[PDB]
Amino acid sequence: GSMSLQVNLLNNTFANPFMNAAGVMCTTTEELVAMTESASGSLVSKSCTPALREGNPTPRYQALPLGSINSMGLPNNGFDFYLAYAAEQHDYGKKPLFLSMSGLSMRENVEMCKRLAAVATEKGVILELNLSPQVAYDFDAMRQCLTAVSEVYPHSFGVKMPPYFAFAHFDAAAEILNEFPKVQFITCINSIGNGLVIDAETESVVIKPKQGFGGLGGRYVLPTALANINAFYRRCPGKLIFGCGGVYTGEDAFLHVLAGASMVQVGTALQEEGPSIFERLTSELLGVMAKKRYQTLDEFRGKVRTL
Amino acid sequence: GSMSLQVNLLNNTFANPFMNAAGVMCTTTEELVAMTESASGSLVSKSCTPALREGNPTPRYQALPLGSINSMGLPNNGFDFYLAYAAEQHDYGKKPLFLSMSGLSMRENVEMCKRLAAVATEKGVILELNLSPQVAYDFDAMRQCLTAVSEVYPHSFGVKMPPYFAFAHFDAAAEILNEFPKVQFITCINSIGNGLVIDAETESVVIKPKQGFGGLGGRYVLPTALANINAFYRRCPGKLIFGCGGVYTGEDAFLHVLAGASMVQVGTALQEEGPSIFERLTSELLGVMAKKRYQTLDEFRGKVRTL
Ligand SMILES: Cc1cc2nc3c(=O)[nH]c(=O)nc-3n(C[C@H](O)[C@H](O)[C@H](O)COP(=O)(O)O)c2cc1C
Ligand SMILES: Cc1cc2nc3c(=O)[nH]c(=O)nc-3n(C[C@H](O)[C@H](O)[C@H](O)COP(=O)(O)O)c2cc1C
């Protein structure tokens, strides 16, 4: 019968839940256009700092059989660039736009948010604030960051979270997030931090920054991502959860949604395949839903069965 | 090509670096005997509490294409049983023995160590104290725990660590462990905590306890294990590191050792294959060493090349 990947949230309509992960194929004008032109339901711009940033020395990304490792070091074109893309260039007629922000201090985030507010009101761009020790592993730094943005930014927004690995941490993070009604979505997860890939043939690490230590993505991270999606799905019932981590197929995405995901972001798989991946993912997810006789995402979002 | 997998540490000689991971295939008398009869260089008994524990309701372990998920809940025969095995049954002639301890409180570890001391002294059993919201993720508690144990246990021991994901955490944990000369080895890592596996066919989780959340092992964890091994190798130059996580082949073990491992523990792969796996692994590591023109482990232990 009839089937739909449509999602409705944050006062927008999305043709499907798929979008890129912040930082993957969303740095340059061409990349942003290409994401807008793709079959994805949305897109998010590369996490930005106030000024242009070169990022870390190369090699700083390596694809792997089971995913990827990277230490990009936030290379990006600067806030003015992404702001201008949001203000003047993005076709909102095609799909909604998220802007990812990753200031190097609280003060940097405060300053960009003050400027973002106008473009968010007028054009409807949606902030994804990157919190992902790094800010979200320090609950005090995390509270302080959110308080500061909330104070100065007169709009809803969402937060991109590093993975946690303990229920006490799920509770502590959710408790903080729930004190901020402007945080209306939570993106789980960023990379699994600081893995170390060694190439047995060269007896060496495979990226240059940080003695070879870098964030893991891809097949490595799927169960951690599902854990985090579901953990915050349960503990933040007043908020949406966006999934990110280990999506290569419609079936993978199906798992994200079962766990509680509203949108589903694609990192490593998109890096390897390019924006055409979104045509395949939509098809595949529709195929999974057809075989299981689901017609909408609402039917099974967050309905994973426990034993 | 005269090669040796010999390891020498804590006044002991080990034929090869391989042993079981604590908790895999060593809960019962039969299992400990089979581990002693196997080709492994050593073995460690199931993490013990003061009294026997039934553990969590089943299913509580699931093997996966990329590894395993479990929430066993420390099922074990109790401290008296493993103490008795160490004191009266274990053939130290065949290989050295480690005893893993996991009291649920500092007081419980203290009282077990008081009684373990005499057996360590007399028979040579070596303690691996399991610090893996839980205690390893709380740095003040960790110091307190090690102070308490160090006060009553006049022998070298090692600690079993959960993975960390941030350089600031590597630094903080290492600084504590470096306060304690009795901590002569560090085992990296326990499982990646609280993953969530969801079976797309059944639309459900795969283990019963804790709504399907459980510790991940196997291929999922290898780069995290290598990071922690190398992280602690670097920051604790006075100690040895035992690797644990994602070892299926002699090549995996080669990577553990390059990262800095002295002993190499085998969990998931051993659960799936049984103790004969140790003949395969010794054979495969020698093959990898012959191809790379190494004769001994310390020729390349810790010698991973950075860029
Ligand atoms: C090359 C690269 C660049 C990334 N850049 C960012 C970023 O700028 N901001 C961010 O929040 N996450 C960033 N990430 C993390 C991804 O957004 C995503 O959280 C992670 O890769 C998990 O998704 P995957 O398993 O689909 O790769 C990056 C990941 C990669 C591989
Ligand atoms: C069924 C099972 C039981 C375990 N029991 C223990 C335990 O009692 N004590 C402990 O420190 N670690 C325990 N672990 C964790 C392993 O020691 C090891 O740290 C982890 O499985 C990663 O190694 P692997 O990737 O080789 O599985 C257990 C793991 C599994 C799968």
**Neighbour-count burial for A251-269, b at 16+ CB within 10 Å, e otherwise:** ebbbbbbbbbbbbbbbbbb
Helix pair A167-178, A139-152: axis angle to 10 deg = 20
Smallest Cβ–Cβ distance between A196 and the set B59, B212, B259 belongs to B259
Residue A130 Cβ < 6 Å to ligand 1: yes
Experimental structure resolution, Å: 1.9
Query: Could you identify the atom of ligand 1 that is nearest to the CA of residue A187?
Result: 19
| B63, B268 Cβ separation under 8 angstroms | yes
Write the class of the CATH domain B1-55+74-191+218-307.
alpha beta
Which atom, in ligand 1's list, is nearest to the CA of A76? 8
* Chain-centroid distance, C-alpha B15: 18
What whole-number distance in Å separates Cα of residue B140 and Cα of residue A265?
Answer: 37
User: Binding site: which residues of B?
Assistant: 22, 46-47, 70, 72-74, 130, 160, 189-191, 218, 244, 246, 267-268
Nearest-Å Rg of the Cα atoms of chain B is 18
Kindly list the domain boundaries of chain B, sorted by start residue: 1-55+74-191+218-307, 56-73+192-217
Which residue is associated with the tokens 């092992």?
A: B217
Distance CA B301, CA A201 (A): 15
Residue whose C-alpha is closest to residue A179's, from A151, A211, A147, A148: A147
State the smallest CA–CA distance between residue B232 and chain A in angstroms. 13
Topology agreement, domain A1-55+74-191+218-307 and domain A56-73+192-217: no
Question: Among A145, A152, A151, which residue's Cα sits nearest to residue A130?
Answer: A145
Handedness of CA B181, B184, B185, B190 (dihedral sign): negative
In terms of CATH, what superfamily is B56-73+192-217? Dihydroorotate Dehydrogenase A, chain A, domain 2 (2.30.26.10)
Burial class of residue A22 in the structure, from the number of CB atoms within 10 Å of its CB (0-12 exposed, 13-18 middle, 19+ buried): buried
As given in the structure block, the two tokens for residue B201 are 């066919």
- Tokens (6 digits) for A98: 């998220």
Which residue in A193, A197, A258 is closest to B198 by CB distance?
A258
Interface probe with B: pick from A161, A247, A306, most Cβ of B within 10 Å: A306
Residue ranges of the binding site of B for orotate: 46, 70, 72-74, 130, 190-191
Distance A67 CA to ligand 2 centre (A): 23
Of B195, B202, B223, Cβ closest to residue A196 = B223
Question: What is the amino acid identity at position B137?
Answer: Y
3-state secondary structure of A204: strand
Q: Locate all alpha helices (DSSP H) within chain A, ordered by sequence.
A: 29-37, 79-84, 106-123, 139-152, 167-178, 222-235, 250-259, 268-273, 277-291
For the CA of B68, the closest atom of ligand 2 is 31
